[PDB]
Every structure is written in C-alpha cells, then in structure tokens.
DNA sequence: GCTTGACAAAAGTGTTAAATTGTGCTATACTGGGAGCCGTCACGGATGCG
C-alpha cells in the first residue's frame, strides 16, 4: 500500500503548497514553470561557475528571454509592512 | 569576557550554512541510486552563500563604515 | 441663421481561435519533528506541585 500511497501523499502536499504558500496566489501551471526555471538555474550555476544570464536560460527552456524576465518578476514575494527600519523598536516600514 | 573578531563571526555563519547544507545532503542521500551518485548532485551550495550574504547585509555587527575623516574610520 | 445631403471615422455586437486555469493522475519499498539556550530586575499576583 505504501508504494501507491506515497505518490498521492506527495501530490497532495505539493499541490497544497502551490495553492497556499504565497499571499499572491499563482496558478499551478505558472508554479511549474517557476520551479523548472529554478532547477535549471541551480544546475547551470554549478557547471558554469558564474551567474547564468537570462538569454542562456531562455534558450535552455525554449522560450524568449522576455518570458524569463516576466517569470522572474512574477516570482517576487511581497514584503511585510511591519518591519524595523530604524535599527530600534521605534519606526516600521 | 572574550572577544569575537570578524573571523569568528564569519565562521559562525559558515557553520550555520554548512549545517543547512548537510541537512539537505542527508535528505537527498537516500533518494537516488547509490551507483551513479556524485557530490555535485546532492551538494547544494545555496544555503551557505545565502547565510554569508544575510550576515553581511543584515547583521548588526556588520556596520556601514564611518568615513567623515580618516580618524573616524 | 438654419437644413439637407454625401461620406470617413470611430462606438458597439457576433463569432472563433487562442490563452489561461482548474483537476486528476503517476503502483519496488519507503511509516513519531526539531529547535532548542544566554546578565534587567523589580514588582506583584496567580498558578500548580507535593
């Protein structure tokens, strides 16, 4: 039973994370693209040594560099409006 | 009372980053084949660099240099 | 001043093709987490352990 149950458990966990891990909800079809981009970038960083450029990633993913830039823009995470800018418990963002 | 110099402060963050890296290595170690497995596949360098960057840019000890005059610096 | 008339130029609908998105599924075996924890310092007052 464990062999079949593991697939479904992993699927449910990943889907729930995709649907509920961000304040601004991104559909699953975009989360998949973002994860693919991240994995490709991580793989490239090891062998290239430098920071991969947008064009190389775009070619490796068979998409235009503008699409890579758009995906990166979508990857932004909102920041908390209650920070400690001031180095003291005096002022927030 | 002892003194933590810059070297020790950086060493602590390196230790934390390597601990996170080791946790990731443990997670990945028992998930793929044992024959065609190489250090590159299961070694993720992101946590250590992330810790190093966080310390320099966020730690209260790492401070914006005072450049009013040579004596200040 | 006040109309009529002949025409481009935009405001509106119809229908398709396309892009986006919401669900479902994948069969070796896998079966209890991990961050802890750092000099006030005094003051009352409630709690709970024996």
From Swiss-Prot, chain B:
Domain of life: Bacteria
Impact noted for substituting residue 66 to Y: Rifampicin (Rif) resistant; RbpA no longer rescues transcription in the presence of Rif. Decreased affinity for Rif, no change in affinity for RbpA
Effect the entry attributes to changing residue 66 to V: Rifampicin (Rif) resistant
Family: Belongs to the RNA polymerase beta chain family.
Described purpose of this protein according to its UniProt entry: DNA-dependent RNA polymerase catalyzes the transcription of DNA into RNA using the four ribonucleoside triphosphates as substrates. This subunit often mutates to generate rifampicin (Rif) resistance. Interaction with RbpA partially restores Rif-inhibited transcription; once the subunit is Rif-resistant however RbpA no longer stimulates transcription.
The protein's assembly and partners: The RNAP catalytic core consists of 2 alpha, 1 beta, 1 beta' and 1 omega subunit. When a sigma factor is associated with the core the holoenzyme is formed, which can initiate transcription. Interacts with RbpA, which partially restores Rif-inhibited transcription.
Miscellaneous comment in the UniProt entry for this protein: Mutations in the RRDR sequence (residues 423-449) confer rifampicin (Rif) resistance. Rif blocks transcription initiation but not elongation.
Protein name: DNA-directed RNA polymerase subunit beta
Biological source species: Mycolicibacterium smegmatis (strain ATCC 700084 / mc(2)155)
Gene: rpoB
């Amino acid at each position: 039973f464990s062999t079949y149950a593991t697939w479904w458990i992993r699927q449910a966990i990943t889907r729930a994370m995709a649907d509920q891990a961000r304040t601004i909800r991104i559909p699953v079809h975009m989360v998949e693209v973002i994860n693919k981009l991240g994995r490709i970038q991580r793989e490239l960083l090891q062998d290239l040594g430098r920071e991969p450029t947008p064009e190389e990633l775009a070619k490796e993913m068979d998409i235009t560099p503008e699409k890579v830039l758009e995906i990166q823009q979508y990857a932004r995470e909102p920041i908390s409006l209650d920070q400690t800018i001031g180095d003291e418990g005096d002022s927030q963002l | 009372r002892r003194l933590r110099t810059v070297g020790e402060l950086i060493q602590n963050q390196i230790r934390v980053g390597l601990s996170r890296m080791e946790r990731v290595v443990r997670e990945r170690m028992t998930t793929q084949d044992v024959e065609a497995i190489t250090p590159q596949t299961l070694i993720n360098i992101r946590p250590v660099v992330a810790a190093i960057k966080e310390f320099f840019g966020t730690s209260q000890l790492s401070q914006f240099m005072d450049q009013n005059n040579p004596l200040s610096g």
